[PDB]
Amino acid sequence: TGKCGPPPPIDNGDITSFPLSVYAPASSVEYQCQNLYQLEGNKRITCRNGQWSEPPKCLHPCVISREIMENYNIALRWTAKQKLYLRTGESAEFVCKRGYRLSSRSHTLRTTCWDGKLEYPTCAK
Amino acid sequence: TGKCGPPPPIDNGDITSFPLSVYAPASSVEYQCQNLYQLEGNKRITCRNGQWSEPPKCLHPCVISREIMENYNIALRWTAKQKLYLRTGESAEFVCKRGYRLSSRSHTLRTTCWDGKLEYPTC
């Protein structure tokens, strides 16, 4: 019996159809994440008993921070082949600046961006 | 001296120019919010002493809840029944469903969207 109101917005993501004021039971609408956002969960929500099915989250990309690399004495190995912004699941390959050795308890030299977070490595003289 | 790295991404907002690997001192780039979002803070950030200044947040729109409305014995005043999504700062004017009166003593019939949250009236 229960119809659904309009579909809820989500961060960095849109519906692929124009919103209606009222949706019938079993109606579905479909979401789509912004370009560098990784669509996650169900791409379709469906109207089940007055309720909207839960909408996906859009996983954030990463920026590579010059601020940090400068601090942690690191540089990019393939500077030309290196994207400044990373989709989730895309990696970064660093290297120690000349005159520096890799830290001990540090993270590895290659690091995948996961939803906004990037684990950087550390270097010492 | 004190170049900046790529500018920081913000939710539901992009920069207006193509992003660069390195920005000179005094550089500035500009944020704009996705269509139904409202930019709060400085639209423009600037590179000083190797650091980007604070980026704006993009305040959220509100979706009018049917589930809520029916439950509060309210509905949209007719000429506004098509305004499903409110930009922050945009208002929804409510009326009481036939029969009920303004509850004792809820928030006003007129109510404003602030960053995705709407304070509904009750009847």
Residue numbers in the entry:
A (entry chain B): 205 to 329
B (entry chain A): 205 to 327
Give the published text.
CFHR proteins are composed of four to nine complement control protein domains, also called short consensus repeats, and the two most C-terminal domains have relatively high sequence homologies to the C-terminal domains of CFH. Domains 19 and 20 of CFH are responsible for directing its complement regulatory activity to cell and extracellular matrix surfaces by binding simultaneously to both C3b and negatively charged glycosaminoglycans or sialic acid glycans on the surfaces.
Patients with the autoimmune form of aHUS nearly always lack certain CFH-related proteins, primarily CFHR1 (CFH-related protein-1). CFH-AAs often cross-react with CFHR1 (13, 15, 26), but the exact location of the autoantibody site on CFHR1 has not been determined. We found structural differences in the autoantibody-binding site of CFH domain 20 and the corresponding homologous site of CFHR1 domain 5. Also, the hydrogen bonds stabilizing the loop in CFH and CFHR1 are clearly different. Second, there are no direct contacts between the residues of the CFH-AA site (Arg-281–Leu-288) and the molecule in the neighboring crystal cell. Our model provides an explanation as to why immunization against the CFH-AA site could occur only in CFHR1-deficient individuals because, in normal individuals, the presence of CFHR1 with an epitope similar to the hypothetical induced autoantigenic conformation of CFH would have guaranteed tolerance to that conformation of CFH.
